[PDB]
UniProtKB/Swiss-Prot annotation:
Keywords: Amidation, Ion channel impairing toxin, Neurotoxin, Postsynaptic neurotoxin, Presynaptic neurotoxin, Secreted, Toxin, Voltage-gated sodium channel impairing toxin. It comes from Paraponera clavata (Bullet ant). The glycine-PoTx is a non-amidated form of poneratoxin, with an extra-Gly at C-terminus. This loss of amidation does not alter toxin activity on Nav1.7/SCN9A. This is Glycyl-poneratoxin. It is found in: Secreted. It comes from the Eukaryota. Expressed by the venom gland. GO terms for molecular function: sodium channel regulator activity; toxin activity. The modification Arginine amide is found at R25. GO terms for cellular component: extracellular region; host cell postsynaptic membrane; host cell presynaptic membrane. The variant A23E has an 8-fold reduction in potency compared to delta-paraponeritoxin-Pc1a. The variant D22N/A23V, has an ~5-fold increase in potency compared to delta-paraponeritoxin-Pc1a.
Amino acid sequence: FLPLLILGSLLMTPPVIQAIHDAQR
């Protein structure tokens, strides 16, 4: 999930969707 999700996509891509969302706040 949150972790596993970002982890899984932790190769050649940042924690998008969430990162931008967090940065949005």
